Design an enzyme around this catalytic site. Structure first.
Site, PDB file in Angstrom:
ATOM      1  N   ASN A 257       2.243   1.997   7.545  1.00  0.00           N
ATOM      2  CA  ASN A 257       2.222   0.894   8.498  1.00  0.00           C
ATOM      3  C   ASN A 257       2.221  -0.509   7.898  1.00  0.00           C
ATOM      4  O   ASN A 257       1.534  -0.918   7.110  1.00  0.00           O
ATOM      5  CB  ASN A 257       1.206   1.071   9.704  1.00  0.00           C
TER       6      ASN A 257
ATOM      7  N   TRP B   9       1.376  -4.392   9.681  1.00  0.00           N
ATOM      8  CA  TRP B   9       0.569  -4.878  10.478  1.00  0.00           C
ATOM      9  C   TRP B   9      -0.046  -5.991  10.094  1.00  0.00           C
ATOM     10  O   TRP B   9      -0.387  -6.286   8.920  1.00  0.00           O
ATOM     11  CB  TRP B   9      -0.746  -4.034  11.173  1.00  0.00           C
TER      12      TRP B   9
ATOM     13  N   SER C  83      -0.558   4.116   2.749  1.00  0.00           N
ATOM     14  CA  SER C  83      -0.443   3.751   4.241  1.00  0.00           C
ATOM     15  C   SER C  83       0.857   3.776   4.652  1.00  0.00           C
ATOM     16  O   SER C  83       1.791   3.478   3.501  1.00  0.00           O
ATOM     17  CB  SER C  83      -1.144   2.496   4.615  1.00  0.00           C
TER      18      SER C  83
ATOM     19  N   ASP D  72       0.831  -1.227   0.070  1.00  0.00           N
ATOM     20  CA  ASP D  72       0.075   0.039   0.147  1.00  0.00           C
ATOM     21  C   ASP D  72       0.779   1.261   0.096  1.00  0.00           C
ATOM     22  O   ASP D  72       1.160   1.802   0.933  1.00  0.00           O
ATOM     23  CB  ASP D  72      -1.035   0.026   1.197  1.00  0.00           C
TER      24      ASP D  72
ATOM     25  N   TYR E  48      -9.933   2.844   9.054  1.00  0.00           N
ATOM     26  CA  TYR E  48     -10.174   2.753   7.736  1.00  0.00           C
ATOM     27  C   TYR E  48     -11.472   2.680   7.433  1.00  0.00           C
ATOM     28  O   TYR E  48     -12.378   2.789   8.231  1.00  0.00           O
ATOM     29  CB  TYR E  48      -9.408   1.334   7.137  1.00  0.00           C
TER      30      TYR E  48
ATOM     31  N   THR F 193      -5.645   0.063  -3.432  1.00  0.00           N
ATOM     32  CA  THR F 193      -7.197   0.319  -4.180  1.00  0.00           C
ATOM     33  C   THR F 193      -7.333   0.263  -5.596  1.00  0.00           C
ATOM     34  O   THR F 193      -6.242   0.400  -6.253  1.00  0.00           O
ATOM     35  CB  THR F 193      -7.714   1.923  -3.625  1.00  0.00           C
TER      36      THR F 193
ATOM     37  N   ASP G  84      -2.513   5.485  -5.478  1.00  0.00           N
ATOM     38  CA  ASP G  84      -2.776   4.330  -4.181  1.00  0.00           C
ATOM     39  C   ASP G  84      -2.825   2.987  -4.803  1.00  0.00           C
ATOM     40  O   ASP G  84      -3.731   2.729  -5.646  1.00  0.00           O
ATOM     41  CB  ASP G  84      -3.979   4.755  -3.447  1.00  0.00           C
TER      42      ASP G  84
END
Length: 430
Positions: free
Chosen positions: A61, A63, A59, A56, A100, A241, A238
């Site tokens: 991060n 996780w 973003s 991504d 989100y 998406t 992005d």
């Protein structure tokens, strides 16, 4: 380093899920991963624990679900990081949570060694999800999100994997590119393959260091402008998406020309009848457009927004030299194509033949998208289901009326996120 990606194209279940499910600021809280189509694998820990994640650019991060996630039904469908089965693990219990659009995740930080392709990013701090509610994670076909964005928008201010790999000495050029058109795809950290694109790249710099956003221009559909963005529009490339998310004004004009379903709005049918001629005449009288919805007395708010938009559609109708007697009846029709925030803007799949290529102006260049690149098919042939690859993100006001260009644009256009030269660049994908 070459990172393959697998394309799992949007199916029926994600649409019904997105259907049955902000602006002032955070685009992150606006993300809908059910609109994800390209997945890769990484490995957190030593030995490497494998996880399908979305790479991504939107973003910052990383996780992954935690073994410590006992209550979300979602965690019973995805992999889990087991800190104790990892040699290289370092515990950073700093709690954290990311909201989100179609879901949320809460957990605590931790660290270990992440492995992309063959890079072993050490000390990579991340979030283990101890809970991840939301329908995005129910239906998810991935386990985590590996953020390729800027640290500015990073929860808990964690240093992204790119910052680490592009410092620890792992990468060649502090650049990385996505080629989401392996007719799957492939990311490459520290470089790009000249076999994934035709010609050179048009590079436009990053305007706001937080998002991989650049200053874009106008959007034309079938050669004709939409006006709204002619005076500039921000964009975020992005890769987490697919659908192109832009202003409702423009999207409602695209649905008309493209033949995309759209929901009927009354406030709009209302500004048309009650205020229609007032606004038009004010425009014909060459009154300042901003000042129109104020003078006309509409700027509660929900009606003021239908007006502002009405005014914008009108200026473009006049801008396109269209005859006045038809402008009202036209703006009346768009009132019937408002982007439905539930029901997909379905298009007839045979009707792709007469569709207009839409274009965007970036870098002085107009990047066109043929109808077979911007309409998605999600179903069984005979009774398949095509949909406009566009969404209505009422452009984060003052955070820049912006577009989010994902898989639908980055699919036809080789994107090169240039970190050293803080700029993005697009080339025709091969």
């Amino acid at each position: 380093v070459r990172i393959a990606l697998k394309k799992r194209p949007i199916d029926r279940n994600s649409r019904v899920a997105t259907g049955l499910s902000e602006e002032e600021g955070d685009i992150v809280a606006l993300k809908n991963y059910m609109n994800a189509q390209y997945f890769g694998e990484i490995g957190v820990g030593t030995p490497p624990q494998k996880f399908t994640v979305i790479f991504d650019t939107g973003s910052s991060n990383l996780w992954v679900p935690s073994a410590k996630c006992y209550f979300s039904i979602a965690c019973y469908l995805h992999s889990r990081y087991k800190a104790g089965a990892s040699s290289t693990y370092k515990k950073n219990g700093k709690p954290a949570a990311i909201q989100y659009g179609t879901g949320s995740i809460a957990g605590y930080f931790s660290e270990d060694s992440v492995t992309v392709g063959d890079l072993v990013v050490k000390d990579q701090e991340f979030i283990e999800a101890t809970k991840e509610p939301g329908i995005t994670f129910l239906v998810a076909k991935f386990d985590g999100i590996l953020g390729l964005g800027f640290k500015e928008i990073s929860v808990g201010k964690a240093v992204p994997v790119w910052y680490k790999m592009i410092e620890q000495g792992l990468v060649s050029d502090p650049v990385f590119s996505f080629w989401l058109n392996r007719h799957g795809g492939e990311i490459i950290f520290g470089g790009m393959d000249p076999k994934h694109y035709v010609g050179e790249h048009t590079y436009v710099p990053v305007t706001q260091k937080g998002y991989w956003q650049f200053d874009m221009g106008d959007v034309l559909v079938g050669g004709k402008s939409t006006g709204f963005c002619a005076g500039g529009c921000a964009a975020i490339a992005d890769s987490g998406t697919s659908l192109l998310a832009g202003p409702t004004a423009i999207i409602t004009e695209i649905n008309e020309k493209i033949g995309a379903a759209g929901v009927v709005s009354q406030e709009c049918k209302t500004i048309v009848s009650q205020y229609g001629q007032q606004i038009l005449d004010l425009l014909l009288a060459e009154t300042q457009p901003k000042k129109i919805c104020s003078q006309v007395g509409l700027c509660a708010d929900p009606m003021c927004s239908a007006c502002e938009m009405a005014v914008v559609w009108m200026q473009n109708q006049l801008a396109q030299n269209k005859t006045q007697d038809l402008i009202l009846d036209y703006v009346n029709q768009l009132c019937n194509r408002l982007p439905s925030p539930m029901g997909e803007s379905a298009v007839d799949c045979g009707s792709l033949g007469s569709m207009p290529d839409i274009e965007f102006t970036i870098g002085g260049k107009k990047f066109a998208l043929k109808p077979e690149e911007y309409i998605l098919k999600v179903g069984e042939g005979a009774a398949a289901q095509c949909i406009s690859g566009f969404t209505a993100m009422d452009i984060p006001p003052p955070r820049g009326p912006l577009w989010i260009l994902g898989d639908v644009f980055m699919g036809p256009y080789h994107t090169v996120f240039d970190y050293g030269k803080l700029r993005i660049g697009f080339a025709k994908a091969a």
